[PDB]
Design a protein around this ligand. Sequence first.
Ligand SMILES: Nc1ncnc2c1ncn2[C@@H]1O[C@H](COP(=O)(O)OP(=O)(O)NP(=O)(O)O)[C@@H](O)[C@H]1O
Ligand SMILES: [Mg+2]
Length: 330
Amino acid sequence: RSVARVYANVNEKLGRSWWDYDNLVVQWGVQDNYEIVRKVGRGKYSEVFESIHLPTDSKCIVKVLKPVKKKKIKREIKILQNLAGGPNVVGLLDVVRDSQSKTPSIVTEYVNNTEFKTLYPKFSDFDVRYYIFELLKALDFCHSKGIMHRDVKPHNVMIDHEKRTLRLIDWGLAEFYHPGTEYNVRVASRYFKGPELLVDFQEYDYSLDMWSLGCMFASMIFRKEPFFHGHDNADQLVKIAKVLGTDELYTYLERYDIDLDAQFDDILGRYPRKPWSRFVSSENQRYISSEAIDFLDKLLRYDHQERLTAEEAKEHPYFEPVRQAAAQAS
Ligand SMILES: Nc1ncnc2c1ncn2[C@@H]1O[C@H](COP(=O)(O)OP(=O)(O)NP(=O)(O)O)[C@@H](O)[C@H]1O
Ligand SMILES: [Mg+2]
């Protein structure tokens, strides 16, 4: 059904030691070396707190995991250990657990983050090109290591704007890419789910992350959050269809031999492609460029195989200002 355009063989080249997270022995740190200070975040399967590594008296983040299954915890630790030292990936400090209840926690570095609703409007056209390019660097890295984030979204992209640093967090939905594996379609957030998730296509790959990157980016440059605002998973496909059109939806379904569920014929309707230029307004005009639109259009495609790769996106003309600045700076 589907094999990824790039990095399909990475898990085969790296060993079983690289992806067999079931057989992982965790060298737990000392729970009592960490003191929890204040709650800074929460998730469906987690609670997050700013904390102190007491021996060093240094700030960090402790994420208390509620296990869906023990195996899921091994996957997240395995992936963080594997991605260590990679550009703009959140740094893993420790894994610990309570001795009595055996509840685990992950200790990562603290990032001084501004809420995206507050931070995104403050950005210039250059900032967006720079921060999206920094995010590409992570996506490319972890894709090149045979890993899919599967929850790329603003909430899992911490940015310190004074430092001009970016870290991708929340690897709890990250899974290893094995060619032809049916993966679970109940991944990502509603507004960043890819068309493949919405139609229950299971043989997806690292391109899922690029569609979501495009939802994110479209949100920044059009100043609309979220860009695709479906009320449920069915409405989410309808909202995507009203922009991309259903002429290209049907050839994509036909191309991938997906029969749509019967619920959709009642609500899907018939829609023409809405051009990207109709989303341009006075408020979001600063972000708008002909490079930005072209770049967005090569992310937001029904067919995952037509999406730009993270490596390909970096060479896009939209980022050339970012590349030029970095070359001249050094
Ligand atoms: N390194 C960090 N620095 C600063 N804040 C962080 C850091 N890691 C996590 N947070 C905050 O904690 C929140 C929740 O973290 P996250 O790991 O996404 O939790 P979760 O339980 O997996 N939530 P969800 O994404 O909904 O599945 C984030 O949205 C951040 O605001
Ligand atoms: Mg999670």
